[PDB]
Design a protein around this nucleic acid. Sequence first.
RNA 1: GGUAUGGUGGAAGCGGUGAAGGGAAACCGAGUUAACCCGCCUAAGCC
Length: 118
Amino acid sequence: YVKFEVPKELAEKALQAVEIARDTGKIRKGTNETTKAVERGQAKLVIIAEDVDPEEIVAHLPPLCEEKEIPYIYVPSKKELGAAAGIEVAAASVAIIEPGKARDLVEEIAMKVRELMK
RNA sequence: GGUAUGGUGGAAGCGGUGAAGGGAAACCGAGUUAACCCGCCUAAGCC
């Protein structure tokens, strides 16, 4: 499901974006909530973590992100993001719905995937 | 009358790879599951 390579520091900027968006606005976390967030177009950003077995459980979500034109990014460890998502469990995927104070920043980080193509 | 299988107070397992628990399902989306000691409140159900 890993479509494009990402910097780990940029993944960190994304993670901090998920924290700030968690506190100041609405988000969803785990594949179910987050794919449902895409399908309903509420997803303003999709955060995937690459350490996932089975791969397939996340595999369906990234194409939909380009299919519904929702930005998507990778983060090194689902555990670290689950902690960033404010839960006690590793979370393979997360979505920012309401960016909150993170909004501008996420736009900027979104720009990176715009570049990440090809 | 009495009696915790209900509840209050005190010195290891399932779980966002979706737990329990509601619900016919859709759908919810975060914590649940503890007979262990005493000492309190309660009486369905029981003698």
